[PDB]
Design a protein around this ligand. Structure first.
Ligand SMILES: CC(C)[C@@H]1NC(=O)[C@]2(C)CSC(=N2)c2ccnc(c2)CNC(=O)C[C@@H](/C=C/CCS)NC1=O
Ligand SMILES: [K+]
Ligand SMILES: [K+]
Ligand SMILES: [Zn+2]
Length: 349
């Protein structure tokens, strides 16, 4: 039975981010309104300790994060340290449940902040809960696969494990000269002992469910065969979904859902995280849908009556319609990238 990291205090904390005001509450409330929470094991998140956060982040950055919470050299609000520790601890708790064998799937939709560096805040991320979750899972598992379906390149998580073969990072993202964070070209394969253990899939604007899954399934198939992971960490940023102010990819939660299904059928210990997603109603739509996918349940099309119903206009349905934007992804480029990745994975043995 899937573990659902939740507490009213945790949601309230996560809601205090200005860039995503009350998203955690909208995400939870929609899930609750579909009564999906009754089909999960609700686990209260623990707050991360200083030494747990120090497993990745430098002491100087942590001390400075705590100071500004009361320098632009660390990429830096008020109460931001408590915010970071709560999310970091939530992902660790979910990871710990995976270790304890309490579940095969642990969910933390408020986590997935993958841009944070060991000493730098970046892309609205103040603490890399993804890395902290992976480092906790490293206590039991020798091979961990990290899959990043955010619109942006998971540069923080990749750089964290760029020199190791214990963790492989797969990231599908928009890659363009000028687009944040600028890294993650297909040529990027990690460095040193961790060479070819970093997979990057540069994708252009306008991509939709069908072509996206064809890329994702193709990559994950040969990754699973070559790397053969013992645990999976899934980052599912909803800023790929149509309607997002980023306005890059043209995805629907159904396409992301199929990628999720293909991963879940591996039947491995899976850590589910959120991340990006700045159209709040659409983000709630996506993760609620994906939660239903995890539970193997089909959700009703009409948005249930709840606190944030008025935010789902003008359609007030769960399904999201792709935008009328053209697809900038040419078939030859994709195959040229796929074949290149396919060649890199052969070196993994
Ligand atoms: C307005 C827009 C540019 C927004 N920015 C901001 O709200 C602020 C806080 C105001 S100006 C600024 N940051 C900025 C200026 C120059 N360069 C960067 C940021 C590099 N960082 C990003 O582009 C992250 C990027 C978000 C990434 C989410 C990854 S899940 N942020 C933004 O889209
Ligand atoms: K990504
Ligand atoms: K790696
Ligand atoms: Zn993003």
């Amino acid at each position: 039975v899937p573990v659902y990291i939740y507490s009213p205090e945790y949601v309230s904390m996560c809601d205090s981010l200005a860039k995503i005001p009350k998203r955690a509450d909208m995400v939870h409330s929609l899930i609750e309104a579909y009564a999906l929470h009754k089909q999960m094991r609700i686990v209260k998140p623990k707050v991360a300790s200083m030494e747990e956060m120090a497993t990745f982040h430098t002491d100087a950055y942590l001390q400075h994060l705590q100071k500004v919470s009361q320098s632009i050299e660390y990429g830096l609000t008020e109460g931001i340290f408590d915010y970071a520790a709560a999310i970091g601890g939530a992902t660790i708790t979910a990871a710990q449940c995976l270790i304890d064998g309490m579940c095969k799937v642990a969910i933390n939709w408020s986590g997935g902040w993958h841009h944070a560096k060991k000493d730098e805040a970046s892309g609205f991320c103040y603490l890399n809960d993804a890395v902290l979750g992976i480092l906790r899972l490293r206590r039991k598992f020798e091979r961990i696969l990290y899959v990043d379906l955010d619109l942006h390149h998971g540069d923080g998580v990749e750089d964290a494990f760029s020199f190791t073969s214990k963790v492989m990072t797969v990231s599908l993202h928009k890659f363009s000269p000028g687009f944040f964070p600028g890294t993650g070209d297909v040529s990027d394969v990690g460095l040193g002992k961790g060479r070819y253990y970093s997979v990057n899939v540069p994708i252009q604007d306008g991509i939709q469910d069908e072509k996206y899954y064809q890329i994702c399934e193709s990559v994950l198939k040969e990754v699973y065969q070559a790397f053969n992971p013992k645990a999976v960490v899934l980052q599912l940023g909803a800023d790929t979904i149509a309607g997002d102010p980023m306005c890059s990819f043209n995805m629907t939660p159904v396409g992301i859902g199929k990628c999720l299904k293909y991963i879940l059928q591996w039947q491995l210990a899976t850590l589910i995280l959120g991340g990006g997603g700045y159209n709040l109603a659409n983000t709630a739509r996506c993760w609620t849908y994906l939660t239903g996918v995890i539970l193997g349940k089909t959700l009703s099309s009409e948005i249930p009556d709840h606190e944030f119903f008025t935010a789902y206009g003008p359609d007030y349905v769960l399904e999201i319609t792709p935008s009328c934007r053209p697809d900038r992804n040419e078939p030859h480029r994709i195959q040229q990238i796929l074949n290149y990745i396919k060649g890199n994975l052969k070196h993994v043995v």
